Swiss-Prot record, chains A, B, C, D:
Entire protein: shown range: 7 to 280 of 435
Name the record gives this protein: Tyrosine-protein phosphatase non-receptor type 1
Tissues in which the UniProt entry reports expression: Expressed in keratinocytes (at protein level).
Gene: PTPN1
Organism this protein belongs to: Homo sapiens
PTM annotation (Cysteine persulfide): residues: 209
Modified-residue entries (Cysteine sulfinic acid (-SO2H)), positions: 209
Amino acid sequence: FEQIDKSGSWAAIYQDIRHEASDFPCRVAKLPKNKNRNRYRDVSPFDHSRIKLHQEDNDYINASLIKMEEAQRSYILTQGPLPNTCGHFWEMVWEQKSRGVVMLNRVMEKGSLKCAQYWPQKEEKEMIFEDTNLKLTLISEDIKSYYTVRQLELENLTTQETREILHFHYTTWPDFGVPESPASFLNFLFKVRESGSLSPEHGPVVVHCSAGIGRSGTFCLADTCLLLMDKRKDPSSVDIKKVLLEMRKFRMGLIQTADQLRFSYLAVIEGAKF
Amino acid sequence: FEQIDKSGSWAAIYQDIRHEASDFPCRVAKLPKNKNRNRYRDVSPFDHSRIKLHQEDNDYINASLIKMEEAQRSYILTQGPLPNTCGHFWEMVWEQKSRGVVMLNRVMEKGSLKCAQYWPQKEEKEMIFEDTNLKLTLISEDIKSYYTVRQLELENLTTQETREILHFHYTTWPDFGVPESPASFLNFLFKVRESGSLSPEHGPVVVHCSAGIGRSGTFCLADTCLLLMDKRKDPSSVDIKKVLLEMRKFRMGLIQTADQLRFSYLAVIEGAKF
Amino acid sequence: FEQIDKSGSWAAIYQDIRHEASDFPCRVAKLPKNKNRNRYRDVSPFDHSRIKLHQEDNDYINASLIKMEEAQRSYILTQGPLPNTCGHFWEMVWEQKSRGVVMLNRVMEKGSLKCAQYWPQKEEKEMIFEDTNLKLTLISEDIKSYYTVRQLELENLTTQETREILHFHYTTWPDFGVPESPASFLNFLFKVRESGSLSPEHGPVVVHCSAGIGRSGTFCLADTCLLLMDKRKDPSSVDIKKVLLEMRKFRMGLIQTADQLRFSYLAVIEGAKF
Amino acid sequence: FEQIDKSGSWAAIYQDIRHEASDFPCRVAKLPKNKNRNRYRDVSPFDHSRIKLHQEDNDYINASLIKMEEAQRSYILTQGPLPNTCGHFWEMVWEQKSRGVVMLNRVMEKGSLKCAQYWPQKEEKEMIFEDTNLKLTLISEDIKSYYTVRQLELENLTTQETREILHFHYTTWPDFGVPESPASFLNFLFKVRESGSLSPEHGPVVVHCSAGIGRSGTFCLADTCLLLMDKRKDPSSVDIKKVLLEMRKFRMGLIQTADQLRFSYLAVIEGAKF
Ligand SMILES: [Ca+2]
Ligand SMILES: [Ca+2]
Ligand SMILES: [Ca+2]
Ligand SMILES: [Ca+2]
């Protein structure tokens, strides 16, 4: 980390990542009928790793399955739900048997609006996604300094089945740049790990920010490298650049700035001492 | 055949069929509570011949019992199971004591998911349908060039009784149109017949495709006409038009198009030679 | 055709072919050091037409260049790659600047592994052939009822140059005998032709099956005879027997049996109608 | 553990395992031509999980791939090599990219003979498996009280490639019954874990005793439960009986006596305190 900051090789390094990143088709994501299902034109799931909704009509949702073979962890990265894809977002959660949903953004950042209000803010004001026939209810919530955790009850109206989804909401990511310290970010991840949401019995955790590649990518990149740094007889054979590129084979654009790159390094380093 | 072909009157023959097609109530199927159990709104089982689930909550499944008196053969035509009807699907196979299941479509065609993955792809990852208390295990899988035959074990979790179900999967019917030649399709049929799945000792074979009327209708129409010709002293007296209409009394829309109609006559003809 | 068929003289025609078949040295192929590079002892490339690897250690690969002068089309016939020849296989595709690879067999038939998994099944798990310094990546995969077309990226790791290879995989040739109808086989051919893979702008298409002479021979014989008939003012003057023998000068044993011979005449005939 | 020893419910429990164990075909293992490739008639790999040798002629070897999805670990269980399957055993190691081979028996136990001498006992007396063209050399060995560890160099003569295989040989398993204390057994496993042989970068570790189900099964059952007991938010949701049954879906007869069962429990318990 020393040399790179000194010789200021962050932009260089990050740029070499963008250049080396794999390229795969996103045919489906580009179909005209799926334009309003994408939040950003420049952010699409590859055809090979995209999550297919279990429907005949339109199985399209902007979400990717990231399977890290060696680190032994799967993640579903997706965009913040759109006002019209909230039911799709929750149908995905259900079909993929996810236990936890990790949100890394605020429903409103800067003067724009980065994500829809896809979960109920009020216990008594539950949500019913008629398109996908699902019911979602806020059971309780624990609000903290840098993150909030909610207990949501998701119900398959078609089968009256119910499941409890843990919603981990990191709420203090700055409108600009990355956090000066990976402090809270790392604590947040440990909470997610300790919750059991990232274990094999469950479907992959659903991770999202606005586009589902920058913040989301840091979360997964960090978690994965930390797994590696602890799952390898060698304490440093793990190269986060290489890891990120592996990760990029599954979803385009993971880590959208040299800052996010530097931060990811910070987190892995500052987290390896945990 | 050559006449109809030369005069190009299939379409005409086909429309007269649609005209004479019997018409019966489909009250249960159209009940609001069954809306999610139907794949297609224009394809429902007549009340009088629909298969009833031996359950009190909801006995409905989009499946029809087609009992052909002269040919002495019964078939159950149904739609490709939906995500929420896989359990209902197997409860029917169980309750009806079927021995074979004929799948005439691939899980994915023309992009659309035309059928849920209602059976286990992996021997070691059996399926449990909790709503219907059945367990399903893939025992064996013999993949051939134009079809795959699987050997499955269905077990009623309450009684612990187990049965071997043979799953015949015709895998090469084109995404568009009908086969140019009926050879492989007939060999598939003969193969289904050889297994004894169609035997009167067993409940009706369960046949399905996308809606359970086109390819499915073709399979049973061909089979039944071959049974008649082989049985009737005058193989020529076998009017397949009359056979179809007779079948159309049990499930609506059997044979969706002219080409499918043409393919059926040919199949019976080529099959006639055995 | 009907004559030969009615007189039942295919076998006879076939043996005369085996009699007139030219005979050339296969010295290199038979060298002790190449023993492990040959799938079958009775199938070797003549020295004069064998494909030479642009390497000094060992330039041998069981592959033959079949250049047909009149039809103006060249083919490379080779055996299904062995575990140790996948790298050699791709170095040839690269060096020879081929655009398409035609696979006419399934990886597993009649139980036996008739071909190594020489290409990546997973977009995210590319293949590296260290002995030949090439990287191979599955880019796309369009699975159809009777064949699968893949889009692959081959990259010389030394030069970083990349090329798109189209892999046409005819997947429904029966484990035993030949197709009853040549329809799907011809459509496959036409599909191969449409891709421009056979274009003179490209190096020879690489064709292969188990030994690289039966199904492979059928594909190129049919294709070449269709080229002649379409070109020659007298489509009848096209003697496929003479065409085959002409091809047999470049690689031994093209067309392994009478039935394959019969299937070839039919294919050309049915294909003749276009 | 208390209650079961008291109420002496070991035989009961073990018996319920044998009764509940899955049953899958072993067609290939039963082919007449593979009789001398099996050490025990009653011990065969299931067709679905058997390791296929990468050859066209005969891909049969009595070895199974055990994939524990949740515990996130794969193992290849196989019989002690036979005088004629030593090359097959080593070809498997190579093709499957295994890094370590765990041997739980002595080449001679009691008055019989439980396994072949498939590795070289002398640095200067290396081994050449001509059938599969492999060279194996003892590079060094570390002999201990209850186990020995060897550094072997395996070379693909066909490609001159070489790899270093770690051979972990637990040498103090008693001729009868199980070890009174899981002490050494647990230490042995930790050595294997610490060696990195059980990590994801490598192919699955190859585990064997004589038949490859009793001792081998204890090793894997113990390792897997220990992973679970540490990978689950819950410190006891892990039921070794359930785990063993899961494991049995991949290889028949894992854990061949109620003693081995009790011992496996001992090991998991006595090992959970590590
Ligand atoms: Ca995929
Ligand atoms: Ca009735
Ligand atoms: Ca030459
Ligand atoms: Ca398997």
